[model samples]
Target: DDFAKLEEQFDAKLGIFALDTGTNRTVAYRPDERFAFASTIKALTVGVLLQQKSIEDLNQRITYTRDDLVNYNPITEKHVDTGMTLKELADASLRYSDNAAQNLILKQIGGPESLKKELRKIGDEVTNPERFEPELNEVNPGETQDTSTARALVTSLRAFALEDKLPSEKRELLIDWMKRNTTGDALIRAGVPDGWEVADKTGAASYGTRNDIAIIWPPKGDPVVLAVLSSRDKKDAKYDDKLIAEATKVVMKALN
Candidate 1:
């Protein structure tokens, strides 16, 4: 089978999980293996904030002083010069994987401890994201480390999709934001048909990790939920993208 071949072909620490939304049938390769979740945790942060606050709250204006800015973020490069709303920051965080924007949201919500507490309340016990996004690039640093298993990522995505705790409008907004994501087009999106909808978040770290979590919507059937995590490979290798795409293509064919 293609799935077996994919596993044999990739030489990295890989974790994957795929689920049939209607039947709950599942397939996985090391579903519980943990990898650092880079920007992907931004989606969860946005979801938690939406659960706690209204759109009006997200509209509150905030000025991004020089102290609030961080390197490696386009929001700082382009939009933060004039300040922005909570919603705008959230959009930049999700759509562009803006580290500065994500840290601002986390700071507003009482930092990673608060996010971790919120996640525990929702049954996501496997994620422990301690540092802000920028700190993740450090060399094996303890204070800035974050980790998640494929099962944990899938659990969070399913809850985001199916649970009623989050407002429908906010959930829809999150999904829409993810659909407009301008990054990671080389992963899950590369494997699916042209018109299929994939709501996803991607993560990459200096520690040789590439990760993606997604909800795939087909034209005539239920959505397919999947998470793919890879680690211990070249930091910017094309093979990492190929591993994820090939695995997704195989699973999607099986599901179809």
Candidate 2:
């Protein structure tokens, strides 16, 4: 019905899922397969930082200086004097899809190895494998690699959303941090319209992929999360937006 129309309307290979904490029910398809994770890894980084703070200080001050932001482009470099907060960095990294901000948090969290170590439990119990290690400092002009499965991703999202199940208070903080993501397009946000709340993260890369993960919440909203990875479009901007929008509609219909 609606789902069929959504698929035909948008040309996308989508993996969509929804979870309801109130009833503990779920709906999904092809969620076990992996795709490019892009900047979504920052969600894990922010989750680890929460292991080190208090709720009151959730909006704590932390500076992502111009240099820290790794802005190589002309526009961002122009705005060189702005300082950033932990909340801002988290949102920027996840919502606005800032690569440098994620790297900044990566450094602050003692690098990716620590994230591998800290989140391994969630990795094994839910996401599996429990480790991700890329050469911290390496440069290859034409090489490319970045991927993760939908099941692994959504499982991590579940751990973040259901903070009570996390290993410690810090993990809970990370979930709280994700909920505060307030930047990016309305793909997931647009799907959860009319009184529903969505805390979501979206990602895009220069090479080929664009992705997003959203945790939807509401007075009666199911504690559902959606993840979509879209790539291989004929044109860059036009195709990407259409794919994301289509993915959004598919996930929304599935939830409905």
Candidate 3:
């Protein structure tokens, strides 16, 4: 298969799962492998809030102190004194993967277990979200800590982004933020050419894990739910964007 050849080129592994919504056909490689989730949890976090909670809950204001700020909180740092709405916290988490905002929102929603609870409600029993940000990125290979399989994540994405799991306004906001999500654009988005619509979230972790889960709407025909998750064989290895992009191209061609 293409993935066997793809994995040979690097000291890494790739877990891919894609569904062509038109016919419910799918293609996958190592789809059951437990890969670290990284920031992809943002999409699901926002989804849970909008679906399990209410817009009224999102509108509630929140305040935090300097001690609350963690690493990789570009947006939340500037808003510490001003505070922000729960919706804004969710927005920051989805848009920039704000660690501070994510923790704040997690606190509001009752931590990582709440996300697991919501995922269970929606039929995703795999993705386990433990600990807080940054620390959660310390994914150990051969273990399932804070990890998710490609199939589990893509199915979750399908529900949130395309299957109407959240309210119209909430889902609309999620997709909009994903479209504008600012980070690592050379993976799935790069594989996709212009004319087709793509909304996605990118994730990176301590162990060279780079992941992108997306819903792609072509110019014609139906949408595709795709998840490409990859990690290097050696610890502390740098992420390989080309591997992910090429893997995406392969999936697109197979579906085509």
Candidate 4:
């Protein structure tokens, strides 16, 4: 019932945090709960690749086969013989939400098991270890439980942002890859002013479950991190984008 009233007023149930200097400056309640992350996992995919390989030795001309692309996706399937460096793949995955780019990065990272090893070093335990494969993986989907928590994600962002505080250069590279993250839908991006850099990733299912995790820092000012999650009624006509915009505006107002 409490959520119903909040939804009536704000149009969504939000879980968020704004962190400054590694401290929580504000929250919208229940900030640590877990939720399923859709393609936003691509950020992690990029980090995993960087963690597993030496950036200097990574091939610049990374090629994509026709099977890697989805219908009408922004990514170019054939190079026409061209390729992507590890850095370019990181940028494309973050800037454009390129699914094909993400898949290629996954293949380069040697799949999920290596990624799990790296994540554990950062303090996260994969709930169902078997479920770590790609959603439609060439490998088995594992045990079928596919979900990630907001707290877990926020913490990962923290580790990425403050890699100087982490145990090794690998963690530092993960943070660097995260800083390069650039793509997001309107919900989280809506809150900031034009030209303000918001590095973020968003995730969703076909019905709703809209979620965004962002790193916001104005030029020459303090920095903050936020995560917003919303699950709307399946039958609602504008379930995904409508409620997401509402949630993003709320966070923007609070920050600005």
Q: Rate the local accuracy (lDDT) of all candidates.
A: 0.81, 0.56, 0.87, 0.58
* TM-scores of the candidates in the order shown: 0.91, 0.71, 0.96, 0.75
1 or 4: which has the higher lDDT?
1
lDDT of 3 by residue, 52-136 (tens): 6777777888998999999888889998888999888987898788998889888877899877888998999899998898798
Worst ten in a row by lDDT for model 4: 136-145
**81-101: candidate 1 lDDT, tens digit per residue:** 577889998888988888889
Please give the lDDT score at residue 32 for candidate 4.
56
What does candidate 2's lDDT look like per residue over 8-42, in tens digits?
56554455556665566666665654445656666
- Candidate 2 vs candidate 4: which has greater TM-score? 4
RMSD (CA, angstroms), candidate 3: 1.3
lDDT of 4: 0.58
Which ten-residue region of model 2 has the weakest summed lDDT? 131-140
* Candidate 3 local distance difference test against the native: 0.87
User: Model 4: what TM-score?
Assistant: 0.75
Per-residue lDDT tens digits for candidate 4, residues 31-106, read 6554456565666666556555666755666766676675323644544257667677666666666666766676
C-alpha lDDT of candidate 1 relative to the true structure: 0.81
